Design a protein around this ligand. Structure first.
Ligand SMILES: *[C@@H]1O[C@H](CO)[C@@H](O)[C@H](O)[C@H]1NC(C)=O
Ligand SMILES: *[C@@H]1O[C@H](CO)[C@@H](O)[C@H](O)[C@H]1NC(C)=O
Ligand SMILES: *[C@@H]1O[C@H](CO)[C@@H](O)[C@H](O)[C@H]1NC(C)=O
Ligand SMILES: *[C@@H]1O[C@H](CO)[C@@H](O)[C@H](O)[C@H]1NC(C)=O
Ligand SMILES: *[C@@H]1O[C@H](CO)[C@@H](O)[C@H](O)[C@H]1NC(C)=O
Ligand SMILES: *[C@@H]1O[C@H](CO)[C@@H](O)[C@H](O)[C@H]1NC(C)=O
Ligand SMILES: *[C@@H]1O[C@H](CO)[C@@H](O)[C@H](O)[C@H]1NC(C)=O
Ligand SMILES: *[C@@H]1O[C@H](CO)[C@@H](O)[C@H](O)[C@H]1NC(C)=O
Ligand SMILES: *[C@@H]1O[C@H](CO)[C@@H](O)[C@H](O)[C@H]1NC(C)=O
Ligand SMILES: *[C@@H]1O[C@H](CO)[C@@H](O)[C@H](O)[C@H]1NC(C)=O
Ligand SMILES: *[C@@H]1O[C@H](CO)[C@@H](O)[C@H](O)[C@H]1NC(C)=O
Ligand SMILES: *[C@@H]1O[C@H](CO)[C@@H](O)[C@H](O)[C@H]1NC(C)=O
Ligand SMILES: *[C@@H]1O[C@H](CO)[C@@H](O)[C@H](O)[C@H]1NC(C)=O
Ligand SMILES: *[C@@H]1O[C@H](CO)[C@@H](O)[C@H](O)[C@H]1NC(C)=O
Ligand SMILES: *[C@@H]1O[C@H](CO)[C@@H](O)[C@H](O)[C@H]1NC(C)=O
Ligand SMILES: *[C@@H]1O[C@H](CO)[C@@H](O)[C@H](O)[C@H]1NC(C)=O
Ligand SMILES: *[C@@H]1O[C@H](CO)[C@@H](O)[C@H](O)[C@H]1NC(C)=O
Ligand SMILES: *[C@@H]1O[C@H](CO)[C@@H](O)[C@H](O)[C@H]1NC(C)=O
Ligand SMILES: *[C@@H]1O[C@H](CO)[C@@H](O)[C@H](O)[C@H]1NC(C)=O
Ligand SMILES: *[C@@H]1O[C@H](CO)[C@@H](O)[C@H](O)[C@H]1NC(C)=O
Lengths: 135, 135, 135, 135, 135
């Protein structure tokens, strides 16, 4: 990736910024800009490229073959009991929360068993993340 | 990716910004801009490209073959009981929440068993994310 | 992706912005802009490209073959009982919520068993996301 | 990656910034900029490239073969019981939270059993992250 | 990576910054900038490259072969019981939280059993991270 930029507030090439009650007198600004950008990116010169997969099985006996790919959960138990009992009481609850499984961003590109890959693969994530604001 | 930009507030090439009760006097601004951009991106020069997959089975005996791809959940139990009992009580509840499974963004590109791939693959995610604001 | 931009508020090439009771005096602005953009993107030069898949089975015995693709859920139980019992009580509930499975954005491109792919694949997601605002 | 930049507040080439009630007198600014950028990135010169995978099985006996890919969870138990009992009491709860499994950003590129890969792979993550703000 | 930059507040080539009620008198600024950048990055010159994997099994007997990839969890138990009992009491709780498993950023590139890889692989993470702010 030639350019990746996380810019919180202000991004600019040339900035004249005047703010919060200033006095801006005789000003002469002369700006002469020559800017040129040449991008030669991902250029590929190939005579011959071959992807070849071959399998042959002869006179064989195969019994109980199990192939299990990734990300298997099987047996998961979440037990979260909440019990509130009051006889003669005063209860004030402000900003209370229970969260079990919270997922913001899931990016999954190549999940397989057998992968043959020729090329280019890129993942980019940018965020501002605030979970809980109370008060 | 040639250019990826996360810009919170303001993005500009040339900015004259005057704000919050300033006094802006005699100003002479002369701006002369020569800007040229040439993008040669993803150019491919190929005589011959071959993707070849072949399978042959002869005189074989195959019994109990099981192939299971990725992301298998099987047995998942969520138990979240909530019981509230009050005899003679005062209960004030403000901004209370229960969330079990919350998913914002799920991106899944290549999930398979066998994959043969020639080319280019790109995933880009940008967000501002605030979960809970109370008060 | 040549250009991806997350811009919260203001995006502009040249900006003269005057705001919140300023006094803007004699101003001379002369702007001379030469801007040229040339995009050569995804150009492909191919004599011959071949995608060839062949399978042959001879004199074979196949019994109990099971192929199961991805994303299998099987057995999932969500139990969320809520019981409220009051004899002589005062109950004030403001902004209370229960959510089990909430999904904003699901993007699924290539989910298969066998995939042969020549080309280009791109996924882009941009959002502003606020879940719960109370008060 | 030629350029990666985390910029909290302000990013600019040339900045004239005047802020918080200054007095800006006779100013002469003459700016002459010649800037040129040439990017030759990811250029590949290949006569012949071959990816070849071949398997042959003959006169063999295979019984109880199990292949299990990565990220297997099996048996996971989360027990979080909460019990509150009050006879004659005053309870004030402000900003209380229980979270079991919270995931912001999950990026998974190549998870397989057998992978043959020719090319370029890049993962970039930038964020501002604040979990809980109370008061 | 040619350039990686963590910049907390301000990044600029040439900066004239005037702030907090200064008096800026007769100023003459003459700026003459010649800046040129040439990037030749990731250029590869290859006659022939061969990735070849071959397996042959003959007249063999294979029983109880188990191959288990990485990141296996098996049996994990989280027990966090919380019990609060008050007869005649005053309880004030401000900013109290219980978190079991919290994950901000998980990046997984190449997790496999057998991997043959020709190329370039890069992971870059930049963040500002504050967990809990109370008061
Ligand atoms: C601008 O310069 C002239 C020079 O003749 C001067 O008389 C005038 O007072 C100046 N005004 C300001 C606002 O700087
Ligand atoms: C502006 O820049 C160009 C770039 O070569 C130059 O030829 C020209 O003389 C400059 N003009 C002035 C007034 O400096
Ligand atoms: C590579 O590209 C150049 C053009 O930039 C061309 O002249 C040359 O013949 C190419 N070589 C091959 C056939 O791979
Ligand atoms: C195949 O597996 C099953 C259960 O996994 C088992 O009961 C059976 O005996 C196995 N077959 C042989 C020939 O061992
Ligand atoms: C602008 O400049 C002229 C120069 O003759 C001066 O008389 C005038 O007061 C100036 N006005 C402002 C608003 O700067
Ligand atoms: C404006 O820029 C062009 C770019 O070459 C230049 O030829 C021209 O002389 C400039 N004009 C002035 C008034 O500086
Ligand atoms: C590659 O492209 C160039 C044009 O840029 C062409 O002259 C050359 O013959 C090509 N080579 C081949 C046939 O791969
Ligand atoms: C095939 O599998 C089933 C259950 O998985 C088992 O009952 C059976 O005996 C197996 N067959 C052989 C020949 O082992
Ligand atoms: C503009 O400039 C002229 C110069 O003759 C001056 O007389 C006038 O007061 C100025 N007015 C403003 C609003 O700057
Ligand atoms: C405006 O820019 C063009 C671009 O070449 C230039 O030829 C011309 O002289 C410029 N005009 C002025 C008044 O500077
Ligand atoms: C590639 O494209 C060029 C034109 O840009 C052409 O002259 C050349 O013959 C092409 N090569 C082939 C046939 O792949
Ligand atoms: C095929 O599978 C079934 C159940 O999966 C099993 O009952 C049966 O015995 C199997 N056949 C053989 C020949 O093992
Ligand atoms: C600008 O310079 C002139 C020079 O003749 C001077 O008379 C004037 O007072 C100056 N004004 C400011 C605002 O600096
Ligand atoms: C501006 O920069 C260019 C770059 O070569 C130069 O030729 C020209 O003389 C400069 N102009 C001035 C007024 O210095
Ligand atoms: C490599 O590229 C150059 C052009 O930059 C070309 O002249 C040369 O023939 C190429 N070599 C090969 C065929 O790999
Ligand atoms: C194959 O495995 C099963 C259970 O994993 C077992 O009961 C059986 O006896 C095994 N077969 C042989 C021939 O050992
Ligand atoms: C600027 O310089 C001139 C020189 O003649 C002087 O008279 C004037 O007072 C100066 N003004 C400022 C604001 O420095
Ligand atoms: C500005 O820089 C260029 C760069 O070579 C030079 O040729 C020119 O003479 C400079 N101009 C001045 C006024 O110094
Ligand atoms: C390597 O690249 C050069 C061009 O920079 C080219 O002249 C030379 O023939 C190439 N060598 C090979 C064929 O690997
Ligand atoms: C294969 O493994 C199973 C359990 O893992 C076992 O009961 C069985 O006896 C084994 N087979 C042989 C031939 O040892």
């Amino acid at each position: 990736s030639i350019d990746v930029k996380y810019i919180g507030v202000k991004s600019a090439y040339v900035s004249y910024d005047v703010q919060k009650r200033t006095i801006y007198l005789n000003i002469t600004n002369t700006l002469n800009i020559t800017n040129n950008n040449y991008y030669s990116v991902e250029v590929e010169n190939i005579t011959a490229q071959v992807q070849f997969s071959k399998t042959v099985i002869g006179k064989a006996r195969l019994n109980n073959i199990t192939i299990i790919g990734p990300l298997d959960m099987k047996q998961i138990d979440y037990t979260v009991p909440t019990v509130i009992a009051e006889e003669m009481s005063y209860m004030y609850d402000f900003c209370t929360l229970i969260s079990i499984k919270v997922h913001n961003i899931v990016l999954m590109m190549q999940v397989t068993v057998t992968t043959t890959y020729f090329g280019h693969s890129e993942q980019i994530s940018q965020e501002r993340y605030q979970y809980v604001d109370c008060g």
